[PDB]
Short mmCIF file of N, CA and C in Angstrom, two decimals:
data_model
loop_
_atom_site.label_atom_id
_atom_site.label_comp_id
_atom_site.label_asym_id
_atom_site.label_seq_id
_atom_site.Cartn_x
_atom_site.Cartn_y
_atom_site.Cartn_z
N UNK A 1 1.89 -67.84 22.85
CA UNK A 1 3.20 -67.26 23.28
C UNK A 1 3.00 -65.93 23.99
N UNK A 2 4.04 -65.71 24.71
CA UNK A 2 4.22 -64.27 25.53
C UNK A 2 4.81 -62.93 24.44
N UNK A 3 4.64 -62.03 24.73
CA UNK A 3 5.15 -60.50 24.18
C UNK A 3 6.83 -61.13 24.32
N UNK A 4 7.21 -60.78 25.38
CA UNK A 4 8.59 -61.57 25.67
C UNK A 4 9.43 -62.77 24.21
N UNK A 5 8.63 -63.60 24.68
CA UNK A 5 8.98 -64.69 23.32
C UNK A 5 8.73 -64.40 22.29
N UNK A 6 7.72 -63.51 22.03
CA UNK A 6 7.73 -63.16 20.58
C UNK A 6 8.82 -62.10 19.87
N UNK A 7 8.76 -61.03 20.86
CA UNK A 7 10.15 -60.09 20.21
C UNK A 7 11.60 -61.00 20.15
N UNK A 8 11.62 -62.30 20.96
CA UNK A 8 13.17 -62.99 20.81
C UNK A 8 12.60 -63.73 19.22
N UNK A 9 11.76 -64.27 19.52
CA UNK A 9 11.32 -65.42 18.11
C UNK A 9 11.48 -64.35 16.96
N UNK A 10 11.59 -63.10 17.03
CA UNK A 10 12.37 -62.34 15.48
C UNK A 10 13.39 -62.57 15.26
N UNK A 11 14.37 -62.44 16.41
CA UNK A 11 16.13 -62.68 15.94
C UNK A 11 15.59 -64.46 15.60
N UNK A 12 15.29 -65.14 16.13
CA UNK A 12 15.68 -66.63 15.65
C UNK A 12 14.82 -66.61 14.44
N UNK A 13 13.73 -65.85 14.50
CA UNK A 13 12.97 -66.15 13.15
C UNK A 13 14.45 -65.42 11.70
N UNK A 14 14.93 -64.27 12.04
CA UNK A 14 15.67 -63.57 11.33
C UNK A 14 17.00 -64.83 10.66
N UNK A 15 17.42 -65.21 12.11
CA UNK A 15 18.69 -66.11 12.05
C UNK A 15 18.71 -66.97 10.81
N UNK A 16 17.60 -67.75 10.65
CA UNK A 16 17.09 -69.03 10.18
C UNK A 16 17.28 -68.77 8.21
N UNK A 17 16.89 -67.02 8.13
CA UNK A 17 16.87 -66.69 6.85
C UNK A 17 17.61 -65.55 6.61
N UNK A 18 18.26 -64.44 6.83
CA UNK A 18 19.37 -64.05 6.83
C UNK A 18 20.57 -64.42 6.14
N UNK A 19 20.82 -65.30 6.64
CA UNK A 19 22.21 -65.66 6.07
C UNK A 19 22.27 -66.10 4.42
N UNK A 20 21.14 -66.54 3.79
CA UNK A 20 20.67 -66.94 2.96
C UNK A 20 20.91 -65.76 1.42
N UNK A 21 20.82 -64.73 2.09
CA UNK A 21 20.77 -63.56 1.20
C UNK A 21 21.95 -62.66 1.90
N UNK A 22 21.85 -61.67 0.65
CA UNK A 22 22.96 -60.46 0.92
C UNK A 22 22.22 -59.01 0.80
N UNK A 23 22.09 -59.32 2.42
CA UNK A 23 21.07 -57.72 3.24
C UNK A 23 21.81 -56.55 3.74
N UNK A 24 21.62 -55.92 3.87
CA UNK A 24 21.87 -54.59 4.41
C UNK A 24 21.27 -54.63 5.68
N UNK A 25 22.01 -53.79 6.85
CA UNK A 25 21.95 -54.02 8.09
C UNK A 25 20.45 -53.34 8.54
N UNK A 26 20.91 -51.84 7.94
CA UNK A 26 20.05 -50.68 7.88
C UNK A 26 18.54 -51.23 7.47
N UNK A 27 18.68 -52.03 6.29
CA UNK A 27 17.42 -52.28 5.80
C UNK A 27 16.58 -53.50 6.69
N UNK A 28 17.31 -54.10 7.25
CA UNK A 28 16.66 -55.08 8.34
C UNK A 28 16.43 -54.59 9.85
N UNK A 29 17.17 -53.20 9.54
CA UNK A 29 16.42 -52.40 10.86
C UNK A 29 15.34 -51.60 10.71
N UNK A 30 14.72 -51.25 9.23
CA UNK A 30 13.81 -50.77 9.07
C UNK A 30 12.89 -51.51 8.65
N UNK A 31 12.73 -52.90 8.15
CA UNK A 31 11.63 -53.74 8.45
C UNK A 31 11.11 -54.26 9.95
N UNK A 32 12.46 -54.11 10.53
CA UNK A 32 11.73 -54.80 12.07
C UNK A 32 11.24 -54.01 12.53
N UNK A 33 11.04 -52.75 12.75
CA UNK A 33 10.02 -51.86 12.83
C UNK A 33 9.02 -51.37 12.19
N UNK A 34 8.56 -52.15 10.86
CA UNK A 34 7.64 -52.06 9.92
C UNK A 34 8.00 -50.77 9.23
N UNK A 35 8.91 -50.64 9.03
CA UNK A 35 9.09 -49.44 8.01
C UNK A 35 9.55 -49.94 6.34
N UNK A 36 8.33 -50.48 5.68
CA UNK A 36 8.26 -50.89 4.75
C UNK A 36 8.31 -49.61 2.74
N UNK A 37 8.76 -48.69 3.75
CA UNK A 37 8.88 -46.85 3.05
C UNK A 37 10.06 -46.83 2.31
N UNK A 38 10.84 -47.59 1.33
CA UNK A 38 12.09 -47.75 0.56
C UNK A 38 12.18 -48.80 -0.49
N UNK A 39 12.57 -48.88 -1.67
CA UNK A 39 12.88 -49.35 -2.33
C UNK A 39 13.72 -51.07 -2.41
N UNK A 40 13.16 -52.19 -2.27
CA UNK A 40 14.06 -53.24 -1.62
C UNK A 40 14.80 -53.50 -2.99
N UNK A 41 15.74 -54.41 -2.66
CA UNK A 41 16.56 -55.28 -3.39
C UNK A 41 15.52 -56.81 -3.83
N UNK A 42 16.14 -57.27 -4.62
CA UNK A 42 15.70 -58.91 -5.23
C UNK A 42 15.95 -59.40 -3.55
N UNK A 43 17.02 -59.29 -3.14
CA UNK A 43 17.36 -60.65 -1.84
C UNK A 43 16.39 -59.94 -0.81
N UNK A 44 16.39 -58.31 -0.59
CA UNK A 44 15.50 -58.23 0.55
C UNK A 44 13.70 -58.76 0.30
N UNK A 45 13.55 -59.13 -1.06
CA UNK A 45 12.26 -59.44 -0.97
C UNK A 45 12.08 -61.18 -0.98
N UNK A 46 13.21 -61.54 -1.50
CA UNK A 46 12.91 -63.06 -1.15
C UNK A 46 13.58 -63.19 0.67
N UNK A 47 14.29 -62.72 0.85
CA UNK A 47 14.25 -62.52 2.70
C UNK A 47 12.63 -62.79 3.53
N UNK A 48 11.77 -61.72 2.84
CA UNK A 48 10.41 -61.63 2.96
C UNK A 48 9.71 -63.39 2.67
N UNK A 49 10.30 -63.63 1.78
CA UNK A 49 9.46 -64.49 1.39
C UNK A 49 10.08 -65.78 2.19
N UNK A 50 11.30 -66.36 2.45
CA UNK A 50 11.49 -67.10 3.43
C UNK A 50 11.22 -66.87 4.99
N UNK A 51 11.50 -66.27 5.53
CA UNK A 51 10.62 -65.63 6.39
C UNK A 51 8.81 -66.29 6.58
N UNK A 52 8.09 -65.75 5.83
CA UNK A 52 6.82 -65.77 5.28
C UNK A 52 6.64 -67.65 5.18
N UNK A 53 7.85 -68.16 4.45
CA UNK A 53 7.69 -69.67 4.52
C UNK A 53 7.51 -70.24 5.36
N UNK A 54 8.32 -69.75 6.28
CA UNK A 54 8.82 -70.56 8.00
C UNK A 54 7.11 -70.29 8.66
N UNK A 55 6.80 -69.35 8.68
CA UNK A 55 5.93 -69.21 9.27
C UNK A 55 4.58 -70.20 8.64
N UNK A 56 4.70 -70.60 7.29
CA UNK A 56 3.40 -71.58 6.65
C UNK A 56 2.52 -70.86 6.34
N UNK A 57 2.69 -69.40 6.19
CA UNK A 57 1.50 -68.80 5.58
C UNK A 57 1.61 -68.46 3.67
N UNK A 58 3.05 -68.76 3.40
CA UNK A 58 2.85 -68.87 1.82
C UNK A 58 3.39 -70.24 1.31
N UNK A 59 3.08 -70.31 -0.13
CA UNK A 59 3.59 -71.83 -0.53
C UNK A 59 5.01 -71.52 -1.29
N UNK A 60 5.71 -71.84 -1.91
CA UNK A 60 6.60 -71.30 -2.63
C UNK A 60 6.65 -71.15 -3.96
N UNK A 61 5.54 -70.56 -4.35
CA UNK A 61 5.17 -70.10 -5.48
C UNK A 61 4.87 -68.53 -4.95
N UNK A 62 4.46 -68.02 -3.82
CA UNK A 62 4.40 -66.72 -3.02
C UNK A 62 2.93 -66.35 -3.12
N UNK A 63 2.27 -67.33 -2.91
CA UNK A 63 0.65 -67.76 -2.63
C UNK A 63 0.74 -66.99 -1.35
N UNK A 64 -0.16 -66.01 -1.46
CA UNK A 64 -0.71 -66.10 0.36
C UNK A 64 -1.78 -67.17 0.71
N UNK A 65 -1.98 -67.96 1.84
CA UNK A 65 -2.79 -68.80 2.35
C UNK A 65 -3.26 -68.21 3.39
N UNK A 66 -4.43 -67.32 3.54
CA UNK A 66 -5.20 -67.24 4.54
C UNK A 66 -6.19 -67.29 5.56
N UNK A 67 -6.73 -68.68 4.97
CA UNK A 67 -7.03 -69.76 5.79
C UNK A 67 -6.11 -70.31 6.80
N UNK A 68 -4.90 -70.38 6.34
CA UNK A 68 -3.81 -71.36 6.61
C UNK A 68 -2.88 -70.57 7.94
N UNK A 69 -2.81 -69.14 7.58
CA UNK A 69 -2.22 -68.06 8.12
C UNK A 69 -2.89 -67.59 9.46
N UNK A 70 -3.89 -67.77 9.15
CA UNK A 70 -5.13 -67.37 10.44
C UNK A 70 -5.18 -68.45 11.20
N UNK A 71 -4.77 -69.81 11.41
CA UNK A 71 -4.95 -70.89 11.24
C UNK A 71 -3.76 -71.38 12.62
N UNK A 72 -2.35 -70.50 12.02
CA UNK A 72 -1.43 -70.27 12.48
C UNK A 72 -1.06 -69.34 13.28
N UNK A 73 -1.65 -68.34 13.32
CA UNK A 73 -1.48 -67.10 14.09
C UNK A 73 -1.20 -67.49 15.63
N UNK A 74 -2.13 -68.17 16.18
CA UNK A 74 -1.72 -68.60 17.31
C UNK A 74 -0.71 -68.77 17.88
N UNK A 75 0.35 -69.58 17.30
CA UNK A 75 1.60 -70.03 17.31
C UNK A 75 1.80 -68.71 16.98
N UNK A 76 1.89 -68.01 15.76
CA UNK A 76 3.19 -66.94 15.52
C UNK A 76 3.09 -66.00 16.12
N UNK A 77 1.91 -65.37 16.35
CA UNK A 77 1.85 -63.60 17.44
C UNK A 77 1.09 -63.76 18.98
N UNK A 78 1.96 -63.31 19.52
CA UNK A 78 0.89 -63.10 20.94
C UNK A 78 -0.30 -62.56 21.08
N UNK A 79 -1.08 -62.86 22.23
CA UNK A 79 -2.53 -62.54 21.52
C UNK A 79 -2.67 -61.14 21.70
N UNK A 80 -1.95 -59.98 22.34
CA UNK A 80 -2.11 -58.85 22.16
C UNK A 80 -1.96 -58.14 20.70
N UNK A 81 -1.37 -59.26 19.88
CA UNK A 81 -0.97 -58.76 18.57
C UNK A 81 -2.51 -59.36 17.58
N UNK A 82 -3.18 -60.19 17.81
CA UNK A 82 -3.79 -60.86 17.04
C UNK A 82 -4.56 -60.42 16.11
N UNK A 83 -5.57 -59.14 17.02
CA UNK A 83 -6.96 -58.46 16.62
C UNK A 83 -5.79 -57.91 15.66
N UNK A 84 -4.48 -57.29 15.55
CA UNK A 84 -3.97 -56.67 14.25
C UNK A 84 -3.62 -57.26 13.17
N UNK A 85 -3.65 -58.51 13.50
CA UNK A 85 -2.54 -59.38 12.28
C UNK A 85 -4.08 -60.23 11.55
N UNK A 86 -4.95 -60.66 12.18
CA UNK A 86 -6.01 -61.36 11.44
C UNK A 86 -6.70 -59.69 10.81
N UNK A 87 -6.67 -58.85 11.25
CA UNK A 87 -6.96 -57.41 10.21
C UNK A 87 -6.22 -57.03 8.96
N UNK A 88 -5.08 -57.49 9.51
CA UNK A 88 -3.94 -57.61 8.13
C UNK A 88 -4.08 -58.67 7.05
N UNK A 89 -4.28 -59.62 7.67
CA UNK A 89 -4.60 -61.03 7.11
C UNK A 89 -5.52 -60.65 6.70
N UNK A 90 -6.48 -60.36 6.45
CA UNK A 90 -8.05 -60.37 5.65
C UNK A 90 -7.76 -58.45 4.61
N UNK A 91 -7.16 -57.73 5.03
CA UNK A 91 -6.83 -56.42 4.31
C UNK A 91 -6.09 -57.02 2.90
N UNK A 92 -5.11 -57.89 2.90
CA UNK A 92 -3.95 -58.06 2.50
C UNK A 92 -4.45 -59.25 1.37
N UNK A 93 -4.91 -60.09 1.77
CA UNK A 93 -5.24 -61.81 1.46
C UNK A 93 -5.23 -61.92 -0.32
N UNK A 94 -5.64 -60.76 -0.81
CA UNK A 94 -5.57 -60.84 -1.99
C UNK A 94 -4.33 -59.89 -2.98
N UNK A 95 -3.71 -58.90 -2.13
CA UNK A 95 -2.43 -58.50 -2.41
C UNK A 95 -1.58 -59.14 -3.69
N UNK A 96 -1.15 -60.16 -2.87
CA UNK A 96 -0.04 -61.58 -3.88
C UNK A 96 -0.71 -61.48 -5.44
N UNK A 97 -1.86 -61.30 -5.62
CA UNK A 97 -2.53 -61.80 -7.07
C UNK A 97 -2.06 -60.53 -8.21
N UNK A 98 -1.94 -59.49 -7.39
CA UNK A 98 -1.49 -58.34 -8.78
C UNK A 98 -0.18 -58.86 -8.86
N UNK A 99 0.67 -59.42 -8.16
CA UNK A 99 2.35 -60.19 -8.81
C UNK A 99 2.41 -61.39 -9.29
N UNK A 100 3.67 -61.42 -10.11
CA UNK A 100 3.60 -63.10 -10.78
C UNK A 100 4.83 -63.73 -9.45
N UNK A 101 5.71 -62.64 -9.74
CA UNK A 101 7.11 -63.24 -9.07
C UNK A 101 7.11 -63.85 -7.67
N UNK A 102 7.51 -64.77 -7.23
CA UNK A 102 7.06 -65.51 -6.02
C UNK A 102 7.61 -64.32 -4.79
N UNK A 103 8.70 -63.79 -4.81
CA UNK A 103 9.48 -63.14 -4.02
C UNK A 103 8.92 -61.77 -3.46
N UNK A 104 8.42 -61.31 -5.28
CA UNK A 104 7.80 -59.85 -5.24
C UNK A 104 6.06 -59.89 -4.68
N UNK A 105 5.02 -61.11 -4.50
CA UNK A 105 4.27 -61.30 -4.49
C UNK A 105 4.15 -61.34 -2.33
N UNK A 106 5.47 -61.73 -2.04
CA UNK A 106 5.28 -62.06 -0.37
C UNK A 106 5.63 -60.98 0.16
N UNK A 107 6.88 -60.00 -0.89
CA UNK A 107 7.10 -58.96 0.04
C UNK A 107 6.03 -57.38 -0.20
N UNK A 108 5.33 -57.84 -1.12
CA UNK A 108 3.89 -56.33 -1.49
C UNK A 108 3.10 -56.81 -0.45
N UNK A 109 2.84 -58.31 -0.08
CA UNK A 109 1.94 -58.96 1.00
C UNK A 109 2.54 -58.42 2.44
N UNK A 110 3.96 -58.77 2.48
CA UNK A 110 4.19 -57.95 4.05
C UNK A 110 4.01 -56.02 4.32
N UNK A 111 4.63 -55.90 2.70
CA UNK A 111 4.66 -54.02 3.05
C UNK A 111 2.80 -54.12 3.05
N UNK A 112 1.72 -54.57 2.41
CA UNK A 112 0.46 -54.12 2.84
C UNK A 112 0.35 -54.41 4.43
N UNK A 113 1.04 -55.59 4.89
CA UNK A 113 0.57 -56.00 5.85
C UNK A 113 1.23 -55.04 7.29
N UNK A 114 2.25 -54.15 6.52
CA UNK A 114 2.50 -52.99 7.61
C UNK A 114 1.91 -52.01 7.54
N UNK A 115 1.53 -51.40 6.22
CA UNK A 115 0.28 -50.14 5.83
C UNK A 115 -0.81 -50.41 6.56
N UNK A 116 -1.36 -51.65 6.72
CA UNK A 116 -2.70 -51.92 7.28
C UNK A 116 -2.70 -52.03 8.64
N UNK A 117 -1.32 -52.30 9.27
CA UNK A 117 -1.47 -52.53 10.84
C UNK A 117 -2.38 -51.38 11.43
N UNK A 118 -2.88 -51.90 12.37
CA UNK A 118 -3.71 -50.37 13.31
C UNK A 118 -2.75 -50.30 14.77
N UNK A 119 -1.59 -50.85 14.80
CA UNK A 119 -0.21 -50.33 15.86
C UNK A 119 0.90 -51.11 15.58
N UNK A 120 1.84 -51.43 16.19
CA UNK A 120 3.16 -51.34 16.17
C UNK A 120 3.04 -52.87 15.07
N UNK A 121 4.09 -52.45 14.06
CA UNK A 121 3.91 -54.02 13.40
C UNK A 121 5.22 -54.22 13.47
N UNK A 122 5.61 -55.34 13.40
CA UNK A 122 7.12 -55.97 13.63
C UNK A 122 7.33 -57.08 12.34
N UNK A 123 8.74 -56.69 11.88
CA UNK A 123 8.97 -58.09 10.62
C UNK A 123 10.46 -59.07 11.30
N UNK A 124 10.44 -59.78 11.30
CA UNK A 124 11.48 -59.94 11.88
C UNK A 124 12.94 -60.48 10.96
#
């Protein structure tokens, strides 16, 4: 995919899981800019974790798969994004294991996976 398609594929990635939960506007403007620096709610972390589904990199137990994730990358980030997200992917990969909770386990996996970016990280 293009830079282009990928910043639209957030709102549709967003669309798909959004509605699902009861988010705060503010707080979905500070994940899409990786500002993972606040306290979430139960729904903003299973948000994370559907999200995280669509994409096939967790199971729904809030497994990270990163074999599976790396696997996928192709499809999900443009390749200007890649060298950051397979850095994240291998920083992160074991994250999920200090949580039990499926929800709380995908969204410690995305906030590492914004601590670790080395530039702009995007959640959508």
């Amino acid at each position: 995919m293009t830079m282009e398609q990928f910043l639209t594929s957030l709102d549709m990635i967003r669309s798909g899981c959004a509605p699902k939960f009861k988010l705060k506007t503010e707080d979905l403007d500070r994940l899409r800019v990786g500002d993972f620096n606040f306290p979430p709610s139960q729904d903003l972390m299973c948000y994370t974790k559907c999200v995280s589904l669509m994409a096939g990199a967790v199971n729904k137990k809030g497994e990270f798969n990163a074999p599976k994730a790396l696997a996928q990358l192709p499809h999900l980030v443009p390749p200007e994004m890649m060298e950051m997200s397979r850095k994240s992917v291998e920083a992160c990969r074991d994250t999920h294991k200090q949580f039990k909770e499926s929800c709380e386990r995908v969204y410690q996996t995305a906030k590492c996976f914004s601590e670790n970016a080395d530039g702009q990280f995007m959640w959508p």
